Amino acid sequence: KEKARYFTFLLYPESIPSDWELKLETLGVPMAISPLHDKDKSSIKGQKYKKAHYHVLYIAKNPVTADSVRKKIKLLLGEKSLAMVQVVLNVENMYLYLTHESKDAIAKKKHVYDKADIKLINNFDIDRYVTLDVEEKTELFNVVVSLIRAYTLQNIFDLYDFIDENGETYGLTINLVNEVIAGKTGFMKLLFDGAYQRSKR
Amino acid sequence: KEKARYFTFLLYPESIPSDWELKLETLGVPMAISPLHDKDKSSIKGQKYKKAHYHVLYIAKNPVTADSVRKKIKLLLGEKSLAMVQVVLNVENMYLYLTHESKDAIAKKKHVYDKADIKLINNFDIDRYVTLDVEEKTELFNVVVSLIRAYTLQNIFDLYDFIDENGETYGLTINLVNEVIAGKTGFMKLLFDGAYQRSKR
Amino acid sequence: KEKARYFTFLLYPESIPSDWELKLETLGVPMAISPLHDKDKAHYHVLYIAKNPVTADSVRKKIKLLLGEKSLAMVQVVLNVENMYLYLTHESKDAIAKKKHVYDKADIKLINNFDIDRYVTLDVEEKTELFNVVVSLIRAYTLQNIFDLYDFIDENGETYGLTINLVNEVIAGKTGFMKLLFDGAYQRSKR
Amino acid sequence: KEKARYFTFLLYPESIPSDWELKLETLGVPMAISPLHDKDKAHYHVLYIAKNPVTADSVRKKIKLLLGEKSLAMVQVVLNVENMYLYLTHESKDAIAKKKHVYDKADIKLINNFDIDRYVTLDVEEKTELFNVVVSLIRAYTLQNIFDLYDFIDENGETYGLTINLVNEVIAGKTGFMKLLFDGAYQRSKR
Amino acid sequence: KEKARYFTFLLYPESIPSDWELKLETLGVPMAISPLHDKDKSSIKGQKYKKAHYHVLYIAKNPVTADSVRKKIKLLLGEKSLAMVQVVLNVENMYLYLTHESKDAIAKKKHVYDKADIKLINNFDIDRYVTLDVEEKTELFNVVVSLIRAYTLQNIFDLYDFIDENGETYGLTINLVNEVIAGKTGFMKLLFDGAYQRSKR
Amino acid sequence: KEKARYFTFLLYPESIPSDWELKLETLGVPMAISPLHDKDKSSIKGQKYKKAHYHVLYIAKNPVTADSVRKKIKLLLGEKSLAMVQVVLNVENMYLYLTHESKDAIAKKKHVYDKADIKLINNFDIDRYVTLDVEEKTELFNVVVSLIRAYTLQNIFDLYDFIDENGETYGLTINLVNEVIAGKTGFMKLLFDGAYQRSKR
Ligand SMILES: [Ba+2]
Ligand SMILES: [Ba+2]
Ligand SMILES: [Ba+2]
Ligand SMILES: [Ba+2]
Ligand SMILES: [Ba+2]
Ligand SMILES: [Ba+2]
Ligand SMILES: [Ba+2]
Ligand SMILES: [Ba+2]
Ligand SMILES: [Ba+2]
Ligand SMILES: [Ba+2]
Ligand SMILES: [Ba+2]
Ligand SMILES: [Ba+2]
Ligand SMILES: [Ba+2]
Ligand SMILES: [Ba+2]
Ligand SMILES: [Ba+2]
Ligand SMILES: [Ba+2]
Ligand SMILES: [Ba+2]
Ligand SMILES: [Ba+2]
Ligand SMILES: [Cl-]
Ligand SMILES: [Cl-]
Ligand SMILES: [Cl-]
Ligand SMILES: [Cl-]
Ligand SMILES: [Cl-]
Ligand SMILES: [Cl-]
Ligand SMILES: [Mn+2]
Ligand SMILES: [Mn+2]
Ligand SMILES: [Mn+2]
Ligand SMILES: [Mn+2]
Ligand SMILES: [Mn+2]
Ligand SMILES: [Mn+2]
């Protein structure tokens, strides 16, 4: 059958032990658990809210079979805990989808939840799953350049500060400016020398 | 088998979900999708136009196997969505080939489509994937040198400014000067120190 | 073909010279040898630390020639050193969960000054995490050079997870980037 | 397994599509194609310039898929580009010495803006020769920066074998070393 | 087969020209030649000492094949000079083993020879071929840091001087500090800038 | 049979065309030809000088058989030109041996000739055959350090100058200092900064 690392599935509060949150920790795999979903618009007649459930993002350590994860949770939480496991094609999406903040979920105007009710098991960090491919770097690098040139930023700090305010405007966060100007260090020096000399005239 | 970043393949409107354009977005990979191909001269007897189809240009983030992308789309859009995935040798061509405006496609006098019906998923920008073959770089580098020497440009800025005006004259745009002087950083420093010392006398 | 520093493999008392423990020493590479495994045929687990990235098969041969072609038939690349080492006494997480026979830490044979504390580096994704931290730090407290940063570390290290030899391991190669940060701070302190 | 930029191979008119000349263009790599060789079976010699170091077999496949598996069966790595190019018209030194039939330079098919003048670099041992020269020069005439050196080159280039784009090709990567030389000269001019 | 830099092999006085010691010099490779081995305990019945022989430690300049060195010596000294060439895994050991002072040789209580009868051809210096395994470097590097920090050494010289006096205390000799701070150049600059700024306050 | 790149052999003025020096050039291989040997002490009774001859150092472009070179010269210069071809084990030696300035030739107190009468065919340069193996570099590097430290040389020039005078004392020539401090650029900077600061106090 098929194998993969990224899975997702549903957990209903009614069908799971009261210590599930700890029982899942025991698997030693990283997971992300949605805030509780208790506000999903039910197209069912005479009912506003779908039964309450949790979405679980589950990250095997090695390529395995969907059914291997099915069993592993049935044994952990009882056979009535889950009945449907799916392979995650894109992790970033399925994760935003936890709070209905993914592109598909906003376009279907679904109820938005709170990022803070998200339960991170086993040091799960979404970023250790979001890579910034080559071409994306150099794009932004040129941006950082247009920026340092435009606003005559004279050092790594002034740039950082500028980012702190207008970050979202150009798509930039601090740890991204750090990831971007990685290794381009020398080039950066050139840009600040430039700006600094220019501010002088 | 083989691994690579650049792929292409075919999508038939009849075999794909009505939300495919969004489903592909979910993969978080950049793609370029042809205008609809509904005008391809069919050498089949009794038929003017090949079945209607879409060409998809697909840019993995990391070298992967053709079959890995086959599966990924079969699961996304249904096993009847594609049956043939190919490795793209030249991105620039296979992209022009989307509107039958590539050299091969003009020489086979194939129906030309409209550039504007091209669907760009995930901030795909063709300019990202065309890059200066080696010899091209060093040519221009020598140019940037003739330039910094000739006009006594004393820093990355003055050079940039000069480029802003006389760019086309020498073939240079800003993001090209950036692509060119990549890694030659050190060498650049030498040139500016030169110019700056020289302006002083 | 793959190259790496960390390997492991099996040695059977029946198939090895009676002076193997010394013969391995001769390779001048650091190794850790399990207590004898006789409670799982009796065998030894060997943790082997090349000095330079090499091929699994290069180590296969090197031991076949050293101890005889019947000494080992399977060499593996070690992904995590800390684990594969605990696994020597079946005290690794995987080995406790499979309730395997636990051995004695003291029967472990350390060849060529092998010290487990040594081969613990930061996996990639860990370095850059901390690097960003060192940045948030140098930015926040306007540290103007490698020293002021060091000092700051000396006091509030544990707060941010940093020790001196970690700051050193972290800012490895990021040298240039660091220069940018101090120039920054120093200019900023001036205004 | 070996990687390189420069390859050559054979194409037989009998085994290739009638649009091959265009099909090769599609690869977006620069090539030089011999006039037809029918005076030595009739064949074409192809000079092929990968954009990045790759494996001979990677190019084998790439052409088998492009032109059909019967198009080529032998791909070779080009050691010297200038020669293998002259060898297209049997005007290379080896080909004149074996008195082989000479063809016409004009029947040569240049795909994708291939220009022979482009792929002539300095072999290793040649660079460092000249580098030492640039050093003897910067030392001798106390040139105090990349400019003064450039200027000097502009006048006495031919004397030492140097042109500007060669000084650029030479001092490639030796950047740092160059800095040392100018600091030197500049300090020395001061005394 | 295999390529490597470090080899060893045997030379019998009976089978070699009387000018061998000079003939080997001619190869322009560094070698170390054992004192004469004429005292090796022979397990052969009726004989105390193995035939007399020399051990040769041979250091190619570039990775080559064992057989390439076999030939090279057969041609130099005659085909009856050597019949067995081996790749040296550890140079430091195989060198001590020249005087039977290696760990293996002491444990097998073999006859110990004199260090002074060792013939060094072509400026062979054992210290050249013993080198700090990775972890060893970085240990000492941190030391050099603790040092430059502790005593506020403001440049490569002051550090050097300090080493000249208190070397042994920290395990450091000059050519070791040089071997250690190899490539860490940049990092070193940071440390001196630090110290120097700090001395100012 | 055996194959190799480096050969040597003898040419007698009496047995060779008067245009030999040009005929050899025609082979397009690099060679080095001794000054004329007309002063070799003949152990023959009643004769001071061996018949006059030339030594030829010959560098095939590809591994070939000694006999292949035998023929190639017999056809070029006539079958009476040479009767003995040998494989060169060490090029540097066999070349010094051209003027009897090799170690073996000095030890046999043989007549020394003039380096300038050496005939270099086809751009033969002995150095393109003399490599400086790793350990040799770093040895000398430490030397350059002991030197820059000792004499407080404050820049690449002062070092160069010092080399010009005391070169041979430490084994150093200019193009060797250049080959040595290759890539160690940064480290060098450290040394000059050091010296320069130190001269100030
Ligand atoms: Ba219940
Ligand atoms: Ba309702
Ligand atoms: Ba990341
Ligand atoms: Ba992304
Ligand atoms: Ba903010
Ligand atoms: Ba349908
Ligand atoms: Ba571009
Ligand atoms: Ba404009
Ligand atoms: Ba050791
Ligand atoms: Ba092009
Ligand atoms: Ba004898
Ligand atoms: Ba040493
Ligand atoms: Ba002392
Ligand atoms: Ba005659
Ligand atoms: Ba006599
Ligand atoms: Ba050389
Ligand atoms: Ba040498
Ligand atoms: Ba002199
Ligand atoms: Cl960096
Ligand atoms: Cl760069
Ligand atoms: Cl570093
Ligand atoms: Cl460069
Ligand atoms: Cl260095
Ligand atoms: Cl350099
Ligand atoms: Mn939901
Ligand atoms: Mn089509
Ligand atoms: Mn076991
Ligand atoms: Mn031909
Ligand atoms: Mn012995
Ligand atoms: Mn002679």
Author numbering:
A (entry chain C), B (entry chain B), E (entry chain B), F (entry chain C): 3 to 203
C (entry chain A), D (entry chain A): 3 to 42, 53 to 203
Quote the passages of the study that discuss this structure, keeping the authors' original sentences:
RepB is the rolling-circle replication (RCR) initiator protein encoded by the 5541-bp promiscuous plasmid pMV158, originally isolated from Streptococcus agalactiae and involved in antibiotic resistance spread. The DNA-binding capability as well as the nuclease and strand-transfer activities of RepB reside in its N-terminal origin binding domain (OBD), which belongs to the replication (Rep) class of the HUH endonuclease superfamily.
This leads to a total of nine distinct OBD orientations relative to the ODs in the two crystal structures solved, three for the C2 form and six for the C3 form. In addition, E137 (OD helix α5) of an adjacent protomer interacts with the metal ion through a bridging water molecule instead of making a salt bridge with R7, as when the OBD is closer to the C6 axis (inward and intermediate positions). To confirm the metal ion binding, we co-crystallised RepB6 with Ba2+ and exploited the X-ray absorption of the Ba2+ ion. The anomalous difference map shows that the Ba2+ occupies the same position assigned previously to a Mg2+ ion. Some density was also observed in the protomer where the OBD is in an intermediate position, and was refined as a Ba2+ ion with half occupancy. However, the presence of divalent metal ions in the medium does not seem to be determinant in driving the hexamer towards the C2 conformation, as Mg2+ was also used in the crystallization solution of C3 (even though no divalent cation could be located in this structure).
